[PDB]
């Protein structure tokens, strides 16, 4: 609901790892294939994300993702706090996997199809996710 | 001046290649270390960028960057045209290298320092580049 909240999760496809970041208020997605589920990969991704968008808090469906000192150092440097207002009651990852499968045959590498699917998701329409995120953030200013 | 214009260039540091994308109207930067100056690296970067921002035209200071069929295919799929309104009369890359040098000792890897410098650049103040780009794009809507 708030404009600075992002949710980060990893999902798996074709034996590879996809890190998926969702801007909760807009549905806008940032995703990319990473070599492994490691603290260093998560930390580097957070640093990239935080330099491109105003990231205030981060949530996840796997709390242990954020236990490594390397991730904690990346949140510390970027001024990112953990999100505590989003409960866990056991979506976009399935929508993303659906789009990836639709375009998968158009690219050789999974990482390319992932970026094609991010493009499709963020620009699909009644605004698009890419339109909503900028309107939410700009309005917050 | 127009909200869909980006300029892409590669610069070199520590024997590595930095791809730098600048949103011309705002000064907002996206940058990352890439293994080599190749058409495939440029194409993948453009696909990523185009899924995150509304990219209409792309300029560069090295026209031959955009001659590979692989880059042409990435522009074709994302609907990106070449920018023809920005002449070439022989800046941000120097500002970026300045910031990188300031933070370089705080990280082991150059790629990390680059993302730290992107963060510093985009959030430095009279708005910041990250504030201007969202205001420009949102206003365009
Ligand atoms: C390797 C490779 C070779 C050639 C082409 C592609 C690629 C993709 O890999 C890179 C993004 C790293 C260049 C891929 O994974 O096939 C295109 C078309 C032409 C790029 C644009 C895409 C929209 C379609 C796939
Ligand atoms: C390898 C490595 C190991 C440990 C730490 C870091 C790193 C950096 O590399 C990754 C971003 C890939 C994790 C680096 O290049 O040193 C930090 C602190 C702790 C991450 C946060 C940064 C703001 C400072 C450097």
Swiss-Prot record, chains A, B:
It is found in: Virion; Host nucleus; Host cytoplasm. It comes from the Viruses. Mg(2+) 3 binds at residues 9, 61. Residues 1-137 form the Integrase catalytic domain. The core domain contains the D-x(n)-D-x(35)-E motif, named for the phylogenetically conserved glutamic acid and aspartic acid residues and the invariant 35 amino acid spacing between the second and third acidic residues. Each acidic residue of the D,D(35)E motif is independently essential for the 3'-processing and strand transfer activities of purified integrase protein. Catalyzes viral DNA integration into the host chromosome, by performing a series of DNA cutting and joining reactions. This enzyme activity takes place after virion entry into a cell and reverse transcription of the RNA genome in dsDNA. The first step in the integration process is 3' processing. This step requires a complex comprising the viral genome, matrix protein, Vpr and integrase. This complex is called the pre-integration complex (PIC). The integrase protein removes 2 nucleotides from each 3' end of the viral DNA, leaving recessed CA OH's at the 3' ends. Homotetramer; may further associate as a homohexadecamer. Part of the pre-integration complex (PIC) which is composed of viral genome, matrix protein, Vpr and integrase. Interacts with human SMARCB1/INI1 and human PSIP1/LEDGF isoform 1. Interacts with human KPNA3; this interaction might play a role in nuclear import of the pre-integration complex. Interacts with human NUP153; this interaction might play a role in nuclear import of the pre-integration complex. This is Integrase. It comes from Human immunodeficiency virus type 1 group M subtype B (isolate NY5). The lineage of its organism: Viruses, Riboviria, Pararnavirae, Artverviricota, Revtraviricetes. The gene is gag-pol.
